[PDB]
Amino acid sequence: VGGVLVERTVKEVLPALENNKEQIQKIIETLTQQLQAKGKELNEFREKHNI
Amino acid sequence: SLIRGLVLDHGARHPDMKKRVEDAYILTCNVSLEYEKTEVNSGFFYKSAEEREKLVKAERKFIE
């Protein structure tokens, strides 16, 4: 860490990388997937509203 | 000639609109039914590409 090198046992250090990466992988699959369909729909939307 | 009413000089651009009018309910409208038939609006000018595709659809509409 920033002003410290924290001493830890594996027992805390091991599961931190376990669940965090896995928890990150869920969220990242969601939005980047949703970004494409937004562009799909926003390409239809932007031609409509701007009169 | 003596015109007790007025005289406009124009028929717009279209003849035979029933341009002979006995009962005249006068709409003087300083706003056009011609805003434009093209993509970009009457006062809205764009040399950027993505902003022009935006106005092409409803410019012909806001006329109708």
Swiss-Prot record, chain A:
Coiled-coil intervals, chain numbering: none
Protein origin, superkingdom: Eukaryota
Compartments reported by the entry: Nucleus; Cytoplasm; Mitochondrion
Summary of subunit composition and partner proteins: Heterohexamer of two PFD-alpha type and four PFD-beta type subunits. Component of the PAQosome complex which is responsible for the biogenesis of several protein complexes and which consists of R2TP complex members RUVBL1, RUVBL2, RPAP3 and PIH1D1, URI complex members PFDN2, PFDN6, PDRG1, UXT and URI1 as well as ASDURF, POLR2E and DNAAF10/WDR92. Interacts with URI1; the interaction is phosphorylation-dependent and occurs in a growth-dependent manner.
Purpose: Binds specifically to cytosolic chaperonin (c-CPN) and transfers target proteins to it. Binds to nascent polypeptide chain and promotes folding in an environment in which there are many competing pathways for nonnative proteins.
Family according to the record: Belongs to the prefoldin subunit beta family.
Name of the protein in question: Prefoldin subunit 2
Shown residues within the full chain: 74 to 124 of 154
Curated annotation (Swiss-Prot), chain B:
Sites of the Glycyl lysine isopeptide (Lys-Gly) (interchain with G-Cter in SUMO2) crosslink: 47
Localization per Swiss-Prot or TrEMBL: Cytoplasm
Phosphoserine modified-residue sites: 1
Known partners and oligomeric status: Component of the chaperonin-containing T-complex (TRiC), a hexadecamer composed of two identical back-to-back stacked rings enclosing a protein folding chamber. Each ring is made up of eight different subunits: TCP1/CCT1, CCT2, CCT3, CCT4, CCT5, CCT6A/CCT6, CCT7, CCT8. Interacts with PACRG.
Pathology linked to this chain's protein: De novo genetic variants in nearly every subunit of the TRiC complex, including CCT6A, have been found in individuals with a broad spectrum of brain malformations, and clinical phenotypes ranging from mild to severe epilepsy, developmental delay, intellectual disability, ataxia, and other features of cerebral malfunction.
Family the entry assigns: Belongs to the TCP-1 chaperonin family.
Role description: Component of the chaperonin-containing T-complex (TRiC), a molecular chaperone complex that assists the folding of actin, tubulin and other proteins upon ATP hydrolysis. The TRiC complex mediates the folding of WRAP53/TCAB1, thereby regulating telomere maintenance.
Protein name per UniProt: T-complex protein 1 subunit zeta
Biological source species: Homo sapiens (Human)
Gene that this sequence comes from: CCT6A
